[PDB]
Homo-oligomer: 320 residues x 3
């Protein structure tokens, strides 16, 4: 296991052993508290965060690491992302100096940088997250980039294994309405990871909301929500803005009929309800559904500490 | 008392005597229990500003060798929707109902600061928010100032009065003072609550209309004449608060600068010490001269916030499963 | 020199030789003194933005096994009233006079960053604020950049020049450069102050009207012809600063892009290295090509900020009561 970064499911290697370490740590949280002694983790945020912000610090502490959270934009200087521009305006520092500089004071870097929805190529080529990998001079892990969110998916995996009633459950990812255009990072990431399992994976969303093929893989895509839900064992709801052609980053619908309510859950095999959070109640899911005992939203969130501890541990183990 | 499950009111601290004992024990030997909280994580959550609580609590946690995570919800996280059963099709991204449980997932103890909102007296006085953390965080919760109390502060105030008192049962007078904005009655309520728990001679003095909730006032003497209350006092605890009674909940009834604690009033005291929880608006709450006088123990007071916090944190730790 | 009570100017570091010695000692063995600062708490206070100082200082403190509390006053705390004897019946909730002492209550060492306000030259140059922390914090105070100096930076600059110099006494040229906003002369002042303390050949080059305070310029050669100053330089330290003399204090006299350090000027140097404290506005202060060239040691420089901080912090620790 030579983890040099953590941005996609490939980086975690064999899911079996990965899950093994996961539950090992769930059972004995501070087992490796000495592993990261005198090792410093730098968490950088370009966007808001409750779970990632908190869960990652806890994870680092579980490994006895030093933690430095940097909310660039608030305490530091707004960065100029484009190269070859005359910085005679708004920005004081260029990303080109910033990244290297930040790498100077830590051993591992965590970066959260939501898709900007300004240019699909820029977003999907994951320019920013890649520059940290290229010039930080340190191992970099994603706290959600423009197109993936491995730390989240990994946790989702852990919780499904943790709660599944059979070896290969039917896991259905469903779109839901949201008032703002959200990245497809979570959906992309979830699919990517589910496709890596032997689960029966199905993706259901409205017309026009198809995700990038490379992520969809060969998962069944059902345009009829009620159909996809039939006999599901797990429902993973999440909204995302359009991706195809002329609608990149746009809201094509706010059809409240997709709001995961009791109507749809009923058709499932008494499936559990999952969501990465934050969640807008009575938009993505009904108060009753999320409050029902089938909702494992919290246990899920909880596992974020685990996924992070494992990834952090791996990265540490491979530090020079 | 040694079964601390939370810390929101004076009842939670148990026997004042032993509590004060631990306090001075730690004042003397600050890191005596530095190993107690090893690998134990404290989560401090702020919904409002803070200098003293923000700083003093982190130091306290470190004194116990704990891990500290300060979260300024609203800045780094997502604004929460507090009301239940609403359609979150607007401003907010996350609901308090998910937020609290989630936060509990990553720590062992939680500290919350949530000022009274002055929107609905019942909501504030039923301490809905602070209680939901207690109900759904799944962790021991301590108040960094709720809507109606501020135990961490009062406890420190107690420690400092004991620390400086010249006699066994001093006359401690709490006095209202003018302020340009409507402030919570959390500090006053809390102070009374704690003073009433002592054998001190406690007196509360404020303008007409500013009476505090009876359950807090207890049976403390209420003097509407400031100069009278001040007579022969040993300690003066000044603090402003907005009206509470009936139609004026959360409102400024007066900004009478005559109540500003100046030399005029101190003179009538028994050379009393001056106290205030801070922040303090100079020449509004108290005169520059008074606060700068040697009778002002404002800082030593503030300093004790580290102590009160260390003790509470220690107790909470000791009772962690 | 070995009894550090504060760190605001080059005098505080003592003998440069031994100072540099410790510097490289730590560069080689980063956590050598990780036990030195155990159970010692550092409080970093920011009144202005910061990437390098904010990060480098926390790392430094960790290298010494210290506790770190970063406080972004203004965001999490209460805006302070700086002027004394005012009636705080407005905007501010807390006065600097209470704030400083209070903050000192919870730490062992304090780091403060407070940019020059450019409102009154005397106020800025008398370094009123940074001095009040020294006067009333009750703790050793070190500058994270005050109104007129930035020792932590200069010390690092020194370390990197020694680290890269090709001869015993290189020609180090500090050059002004255009900037759209009026910047403090703290970095330039500080750089000169430290260079003047070395046996290097030091030259300062800037446009007419931008002369720095004499006490800082010392007896360094001042060349108004940029191209002349650059001739055969071994190190180029670029940095913008607003006017200082008489009627133009804190003002932009020029934005002459001819001073932008580009290849044109570097060519005339002795293949000199390029330095800058950062942040840097590309194609304003320096050309993309210049800063990206291999002669640019901008990052190695920034990196040394961790070292300068670790040394200063170590010294301060060693002299704690
Ligand atoms: C972790 C989720 C972050 C974000 N959600 C929102 C609502 O901003 C997203 O969809 O990527
Ligand atoms: C610690 C005091 C906090 C607050 N003060 C202000 C000014 O908001 C209050 O009166 O509750
Ligand atoms: C490192 C200090 C940077 C600062 N510059 C700005 C942009 O305010 C200054 O000139 O002091």
């Amino acid at each position: 296991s030579h983890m040099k970064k953590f941005t996609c499911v490939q980086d975690i290697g064999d899911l079996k052993s990965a899950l093994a370490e996961s539950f090992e740590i769930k059972k004995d949280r501070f087992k490796y508290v000495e592993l990261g002694r005198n090792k410093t983790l730098l968490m950088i945020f370009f966007n808001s965060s409750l779970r990632t912000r908190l869960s990652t610090q806890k994870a680092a502490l579980n490994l006895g690491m030093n933690v430095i959270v940097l909310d660039i934009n608030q305490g530091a200087w707004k960065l100029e992302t484009e190269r070859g521009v005359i910085m005679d305006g708004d920005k004081e520092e260029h990303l080109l100096e910033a990244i290297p500089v930040m790498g100077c004071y830590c051993d591992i870097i965590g970066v959260r940088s939501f898709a900007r929805f300004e240019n699909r190529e820029y977003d999907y080529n994951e320019v920013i997250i890649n520059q940290f990998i290229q010039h930080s001079g340190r191992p970099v892990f994603s706290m959600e980039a423009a197109t993936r969110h491995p730390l989240q998916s990994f946790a989702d995996l852990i919780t499904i294994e943790e709660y599944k009633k059979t070896a290969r459950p039917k896991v259905v990812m469903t779109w839901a309405p949201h008032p703002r255009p959200l990245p497809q990072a979570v959906p992309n990431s979830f699919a990517e990871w589910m496709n890596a399992t032997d689960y029966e994976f199905v993706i259901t969303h409205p017309e026009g909301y198809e995700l990038d093929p490379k992520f969809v893989g060969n998962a069944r895509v059902e345009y009829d929500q009620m159909k996809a839900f039939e006999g599901a064992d797990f429902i993973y709801a999440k909204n995302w803005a359009a991706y195809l052609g002329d609608n990149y980053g746009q809201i094509l619908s706010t059809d409240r009929n997709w709001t995961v309510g009791d109507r749809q859950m009923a058709v499932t095999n008494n499936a559990y309800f999952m969501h990465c959070l934050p969640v807008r109640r009575n938009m993505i899911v009904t108060d009753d559904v999320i409050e029902s005992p089938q909702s494992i939203v919290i246990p899920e969130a909880a596992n974020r500490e685990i996924s992070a501890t494992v990834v952090l541990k791996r990265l540490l183990e491979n530090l020079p």
